[PDB]
Amino acid sequence: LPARICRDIELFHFDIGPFENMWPGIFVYMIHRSCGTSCFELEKLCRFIMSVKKNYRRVPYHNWKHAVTVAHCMYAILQNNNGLFTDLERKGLLIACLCHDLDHRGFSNSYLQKFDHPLAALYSTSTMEQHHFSQTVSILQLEGHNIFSTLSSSEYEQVLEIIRKAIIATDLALYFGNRKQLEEMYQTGSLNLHNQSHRDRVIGLMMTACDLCSVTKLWPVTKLTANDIYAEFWAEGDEMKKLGIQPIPMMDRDKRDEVPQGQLGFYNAVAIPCYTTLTQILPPTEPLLKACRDNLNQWEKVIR
Ligand SMILES: COc1cc2ncnc(N3CC[C@@H](Oc4ccc5ccccc5c4)C3)c2cc1OC
Ligand SMILES: [Mg+2]
Ligand SMILES: [Zn+2]
């Protein structure tokens, strides 16, 4: 509601600030603007939001702030591509973004597999992401939390499927193949948004874009966010060392001087191709790409 947030929330590079109690109203505002004050019952939605918050953990990066920030990036993409996605897709994607890291411990799928965690026996591929979706469903199934209760049974199954595919697509290992397919479709002119399977890929890429969006903020935000990202990675690295396994250098706090080189690698192999491809499909997302490039230049600056 405050006037500065009113204006600035429309910017792709908005940062949601340090006042946690404001983040729910920020999410409600985004969801009402992206699909009527009259869709979700307000008391039901508020109850849902607080239970989601509660099942996020106090880890350095994959926390409740990240969830809302990823939702905000989705809001921004959707607001600047009016008319492409249906009411149902927009509601589903925003809720998917809010829920997409539920009950995250700060550890990757690879660590969970190497640790032999029970979640890895339950869900062999995209382990944390299948968990995040299971948590979403369990929250929806609590008395008073079914924010989709006015939908038909068919539309409910539809939106849950939208949410499921969107959360799964946040498994970055899936992004490389997805992005390759989308680039082949762009270049041959075969991409068709009326084709559900194509549409699903586009939405997947949007989920990657939102999930990575720390690299599309202004430099001071991007830089400070990277401290939280590496704080989790280095903790996992420590855990890897404790299982008897040399971690990759990105996770090795002893190789912390190579952070800039590591960022260069990531921007070159992941972030820039991600936002390049997104911009080709959805040209109004260009500010994400531009901000990404500016941050690549800042990292190159750090190296000199
Ligand atoms: C802004 O900085 C970020 C932001 C991130 N957000 C989400 N997930 C990340 N990691 C998950 C597993 C890792 O997967 C890679 C795939 C391809 C690579 C190519 C080159 C370098 C690193 C790479 C990491 C990357 C990640 C890493 C980052 O910097 C190193
Ligand atoms: Mg995740
Ligand atoms: Zn995430």
Curated annotation (Swiss-Prot):
It is found in: Cytoplasm, Cytosol. 3',5'-cyclic AMP binds at residues 62, 263. The active site is at residue 62. 3',5'-cyclic GMP binds at residues 62, 263. Residues 1-304 form the PDEase domain. A divalent metal cation 2 binds at residue 101. A divalent metal cation 1 binds at residues 66, 100-101, 211. Detected in striatum and testis (at protein level). Detected in whole brain, hippocampus, olfactory bulb, striatum neurons and testis. Induction: Up-regulated in brain after seizures. Up-regulated in the hippocampus one hour after induction of long-term potentiation. Homodimer. The tandem GAF domains bind cAMP, and regulate enzyme activity. The binding of cAMP stimulates enzyme activity. Belongs to the cyclic nucleotide phosphodiesterase family. Plays a role in signal transduction by regulating the intracellular concentration of cyclic nucleotides. Can hydrolyze both cAMP and cGMP, but has higher affinity for cAMP and is more efficient with cAMP as substrate. This is cAMP and cAMP-inhibited cGMP 3',5'-cyclic phosphodiesterase 10A. It comes from Rattus norvegicus (Rat). The chain holds residues 464 to 767 of 794 of the full protein.
